[PDB]
Paper text:
Wntless (WLS), an evolutionarily conserved multi-pass transmembrane protein, is essential for secretion of Wnt proteins. WLS has been found to directly interact with Wnts throughout the secretory route initiated from ER, then Golgi, secretory vesicles and finally cell membrane. Wnt-triggered signaling pathways control many crucial life events, whereas aberrant Wnt signaling is tightly associated with many human diseases including cancers. The transmembrane domain of WLS bears a GPCR fold, with a conserved core cavity and a lateral opening.
Here, we report a cryo-EM structure of wild type (WT) human WLS in complex with Wnt3a at 2.2 Å resolution. The built model comprises 496 residues of 541-residue WLS and 334 residues of Wnt3a after cleavage of signal peptide. In the overall structure, Wnt3a perches on the luminal side of WLS with several β-hairpin and loop regions (Hairpin-1, Hairpin-2 and W-loop) interacting with WLS extensively and generate three major interfaces. WLS looks like a grasping right hand that seizes one finger (Hairpin-1) of Wnt3a bearing the conserved palmitoleoylated Ser209, which is reported to be essential for Wnt secretion and interaction with Frizzled receptors on cell membrane. Wnt3a pinches WLS with another two fingers (Hairpin-2 and W-loop) at the luminal region of WLS. Wnt3a is palmitoleoylated with density for PAM clearly resolved, and the modification was confirmed by mass spectrometry. Intriguingly, we found in the TM domain of WLS there is a large hydrophobic cavity and a lateral opening between TM6 and TM7 that exposes the cavity to membrane environment. This cavity accommodates the extruding Hairpin-1 of Wnt3a, and one POPC molecule, clearly identified in the EM map. At Interface 2, Wnt3a Hairpin-2, containing Trp333 and stabilized by the disulfide bond formed between Cys334 and Cys335, extensively interacts with residues in a hydrophobic pocket at the distal region of WLS luminal domain. At Interface 3, Trp150 on Wnt3a W-loop forms hydrophobic interactions with Met101, Met103, and Phe107 in the loop between β-strand 2 (β2) and β-strand 3 (β3) of WLS luminal domain.
Numbering used by the authors:
A (entry chain B): 3 to 498
B (entry chain A): 19 to 352
């Protein structure tokens, strides 16, 4: 007998009221205080000319400010000055003038967008690839030499189309090229970063030949807003004490009983631990230590919760068939849980492949070669099939539960007070959670669609509301609150 | 022309892209509003002169075979000559492309980090204030529009029929850029799935903007001048011909005076002759150059030009290949 089966309809309404008030606050904080999730800043590179100086004495080229490079304003000016390919390096200073990076920025994503001209003598070949020679440095203060962070080679394929007719009238028009991935850094620990890209040409090896005429390179830097991180941490700090206390209350209720615990109780508690793991501000060390592994941690933690939530739903349904069941062991649901273990395992490998190599080579992409693409898709496809099998076995489980309920709720006159109240409770307990779970899922999906299609913010009077932010804080709070309700309402009822 | 400071793009320009800090000294067409700007926004002033230069190169490309080629006289006190003293179709284009050029050049220069006064600048902001270190600097995309509307449109508020034309066409340039920006999005999240999408707008190439305004040039409407005021006086405004046609706003070009004849030299109308021009150099068929010369007998010149040939043609510059000569037949008119 769970607590939810002994609460009157009145008492449940009071609890619901309290839970709703908190849910409203969660939205208000994200919308009205947080600045919004992320910012993207566009950069244009400067074309610096090396006067045949850089051999082993790495000289870092600074786009602007004191000790700036000798730069060419337009690539065509190279020809009258006899400047050859390989003598021009593209320099970008990541923070803009009179701006700094701070540890509160959690990551940086970098993408490149090439501006390639059409000329009849310089067209893009069918299998055109760009081989970038890329070096990155960091600096902590203005009056210090740049210190190297990474030096790698970054081949990328070109995907470009030309929509005008290819005739001698439209020369000078640009290709329409897609976005190329470039770099992922999982930590922001230094104030300044300097990026130098060179494009060497070698005729006998077809290295950067037949890649068209390249005139400019654009870079976009994406980072999470500092104010969003600060608000997010404050929210997690609030939640952790609350989760800790209820976890301890729940534990003591389970163990101080006249009967050993049952399987559903063990699963509900285990789901509590997974949420406690995602609510701990482990990230509040990212502002003091340069730990590049925090982005993969975040993913693993979040992925575990998903697995636990999907498993809970299976066990819950399996624990509420009336006749023929009330089974209590883990070893016999492997028919319904297997698909989850396989799917999560395969996604784990996929993320580990992309994320783990990023930790050792910031200029990595699993989608660089045909073989990498084939394997990456194989893991996604398997995960997708397993998730669909999960959805079909959950639906059958539910179907069978309901037909059993229709039977049990019919042959009621011939049992006694003790057995009748027992089953009437189970019937209610089941129906209640199903309606709440569907409402929670429906709200999450509908608001993901209103975050992926709308503008991102709404200006209404003197107040600007952040919609993408309110999404994250509201849903984050919602599932934790739902787990809080689950542990309180479904704990054993104390009787004397 | 009609605006004088456009002359900064020619002659004295001499690549004054920040290495020549000539501030509010040479700007030849300047009102009190422009003086305040050029004194407060000094780091971005070289980008305005470059923006005009860009517009000049584009109009000369776009009109290379239209009798009127966008000619720029050496006087530098009137960069295109008297041809732009009338409210004609050619002026509408030059105004729109010049306005677009300034906004374009300023935005690119800010993206290169050439100025610390461009848009957002702050090294600190915890207490919530939409600063770099709390909320992000998202206002940097409107700066180029501010410079073009603040500096260029400073003499255009005088109550005159021509002033109305100029204001409309200058906005057409700025709107042409805004209408052609592209939206790109990067998908990232738990596993790369689109839980966080980050989107940005990118600038178009200027060739597309040139072509757009060239189409609007040919489709440009005729307006008539109407005058009234409440108090004793007149203010001149334009009345579009909405009896048959459909004139819009922030998309199109307007005019109200007739274009001149460009066939023969005429010093009073600012018209340069086409007596010495070439033809059959494009498709070598039938093209606008058949009317360009306004004459007949396009057969006068042979050439033996030297060019580089048999080359590898690398992705950048100074290919360093062999020379050869070719014989050309040029259908030059008299
Ligand atoms: C399927 C259809 C739609 C899928 C909806 C996906 C919703 C994603 C919401 C993300 C979220 O709200 O992220 C909050 C926490 C993770 O918090 P974090 O600080 O690690 O994220 C740091 C990342 N940042 C700072 C950017 C938030 O997510 C969590 O805890 C777990 C949230 C559990 C959501 C389960 C949704 C099940 C609904 C329907 C299934 C059918
Ligand atoms: C029994 C349970 C007890 C729970 C409470 C006990 C623990 C309380 C301890 C801390 C709560 C506040 C945490 C502050 C963290 C500050 C981080 C920081 O470094 O501060 C950044 C900005 C201040 O901004 P500023 O410094 O520029 O001024 O902090 C902000 O904005 C924060 C703005 C307000 C956002 C938090 C709202 C929390 C509500 C959650 C509802 C959840 C419903 C489910
Ligand atoms: C994420 C992974 C989550 C993993 C969660 C694992 C949860 C383990 C949760 C394991 O719980 C087992 C205890 O509750 C067993 O209780 P006792 O041995 O004290 O039996 C009591 C007997 N009387 C006193 C009632 C008669
Ligand atoms: C509500 C309570 C129980 C939550 C506790 C969360 C813990 C892990 C958080 C709360 C305050 C955090 C600290 C706050 C400030 C700093 C200074 C910084 O330069 C290094 C990290 C450090 C030292 C943090 C370490 C992690 C920390 C101790
Ligand atoms: C549940 C599978 C058991 C075997 C090992 C799994 C371990 C960690 C689970 C987290 C991975 C979830 C995928 C990460 C999200 C993306 O990718």
């Amino acid at each position: 007998g769970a607590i939810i089966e002994n609460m009157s309809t009145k008492k449940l309404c009071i609890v619901g009221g309290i839970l709703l008030v908190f849910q409203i606050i969660a939205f208000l904080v994200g919308g009205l205080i947080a600045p919004g999730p992320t910012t993207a800043v566009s950069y244009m590179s400067v074309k610096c000319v090396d006067a045949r100086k850089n051999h082993h004495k790495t000289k870092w080229f600074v786009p602007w400010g004191p000790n700036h490079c000798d730069k060419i304003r337009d690539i065509e000016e190279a020809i009258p000055r006899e400047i050859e390919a390989n003598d021009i390096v593209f320099s970008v200073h990541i923070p803009l003038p009179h701006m700094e990076m701070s540890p509160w920025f959690q990551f940086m994503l970098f993408i490149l967008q090439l501006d390639i001209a059409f000329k009849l003598n310089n067209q893009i070949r069918e299998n055109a690839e760009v081989s970038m020679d890329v070096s990155l440095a960091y600096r902590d203060d203005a009056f210090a030499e740049w210190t190297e962070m990474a030096h790698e080679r970054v081949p990328r394929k070109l995907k470009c189309t030309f929509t005008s007719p290819k005739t001698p009238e439209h020369e000078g028009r640009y290709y329409e090229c897609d976005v190329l991935p470039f770099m992922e850094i999982g930590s922001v620990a230094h104030k300044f970063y300097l990026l130098n890209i060179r494009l060497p040409v070698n005729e006998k090896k077809k290295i950067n030949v037949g890649i068209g005429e390249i005139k400019d390179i654009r870079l976009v830097g994406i980072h999470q807003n500092g104010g969003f991180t600060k608000v997010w941490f404050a929210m997690k700090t609030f939640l952790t004490p609350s989760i800790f206390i209820i976890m301890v209350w729940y534990w003591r209720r389970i163990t101080m009983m006249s009967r050993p615990p049952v399987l559903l109780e063990k699963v509900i508690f285990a789901l509590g631990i997974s949420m406690t793991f995602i609510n701990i501000p482990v990230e509040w060390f990212s502002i003091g230590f340069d730990w590049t592994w925090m982005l993969l941690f975040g993913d693993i933690r979040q992925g575990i919760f998903y697995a636990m939530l999907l498993s809970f739903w299976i066990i819950f349904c399996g624990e509420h068939m009336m006749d023929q069941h009330e089974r209590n062991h883990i070893a016999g649901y492997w028919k319904q849980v297997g698909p989850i273990a396989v799917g999560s395992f395969c996604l784990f490998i996929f993320d580990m492949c992309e994320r783990g190599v990023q930790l050792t080579n910031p200029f990595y992409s699993i989608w660089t070669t045909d073989i990498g693409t084939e394997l990456a898709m194989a893991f996604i496809i398997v995960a997708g099939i397993c998730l669909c099998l999960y959805f079909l076995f959950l639906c059958f489980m539910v179907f069978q539960v309901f037909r059993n309920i229709s039977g049990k709720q019919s042959s009621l006159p011939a049992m006694s007070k003790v057995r009748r109240l027992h089953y009437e409770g189970l019937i209610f307990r089941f129906k209640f959670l199903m309606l709440i779970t569907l409402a929670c899922a429906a709200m999450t999906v509908i608001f993901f669609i209103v975050s992926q299609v709308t503008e991102g913010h709404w200006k209404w009077g003197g107040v600007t509301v952040q919609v993408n932010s309110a999404f994250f804080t509201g849903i984050y709070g919602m599932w934790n609150l739902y787990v809080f309700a689950l542990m309180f309402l479904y704990a054993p009822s104390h009787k004397n | 022309s009609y605006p004088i400071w456009w002359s900064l793009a020619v002659g004295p320009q001499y690549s004054s892209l920040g290495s020549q800090p000539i501030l509010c000294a040479s700007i030849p067409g300047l009102v009190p509003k422009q003086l305040r700007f050029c004194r407060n926004y000094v780091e971005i002033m070289p980008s305005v002169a470059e923006g005009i230069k860009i517009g000049i190169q584009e109009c000369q490309h776009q009109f290379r075979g239209r009798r009127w080629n966008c000619t720029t006289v050496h006087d530098s006190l009137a960069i295109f000559g008297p041809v732009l003293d009338k409210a004609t179709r050619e002026s509408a284009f030059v105004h729109a492309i010049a306005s677009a050029g300034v906004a374009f050049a300023v935005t690119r220069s800010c993206a290169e980090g050439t100025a610390a006064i461009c848009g957002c600048s702050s090294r600190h902001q915890g207490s919530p204030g939409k600063g770099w270190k709390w909320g992000g600097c998202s206002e940097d995309i409107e700066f180029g529009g501010m410079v073009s509307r603040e500096f260029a449109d400073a003499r255009e508020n005088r109550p005159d029929a021509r002033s109305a034309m100029n204001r409309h066409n200058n906005e057409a340039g700025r709107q042409a850029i805004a209408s052609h920006m592209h939206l790109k999005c990067k998908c990232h999240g738990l596993s790369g799935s689109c839980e966080v999408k980050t989107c940005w707008w990118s600038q178009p190439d200027f060739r597309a903007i040139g072509d757009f305004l060239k189409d609007k040039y040919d489709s440009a409407s005729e307006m008539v001048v109407e005058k009234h005021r409440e108090s004793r006086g007149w203010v001149e405004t334009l009345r579009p011909r909405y009896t048959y046609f459909k004139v819009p706003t922030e998309r199109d070009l307007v005019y109200y005076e007739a274009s001149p004849n460009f066939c023969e030299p005429n010093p009073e109308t600012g018209s340069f002759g086409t007596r010495d021009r070439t033809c059959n150099v494009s498709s070598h068929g039938i093209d606008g150059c058949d009317l360009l010369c306004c004459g007949r007998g396009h057969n006068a010149r042979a050439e033996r030009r030297r060019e580089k040939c048999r080359c590898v043609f690398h992705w950048c510059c100074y290919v360093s290949c062999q020379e050869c000569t070719r014989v050309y037949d040029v259908h030059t008119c008299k």
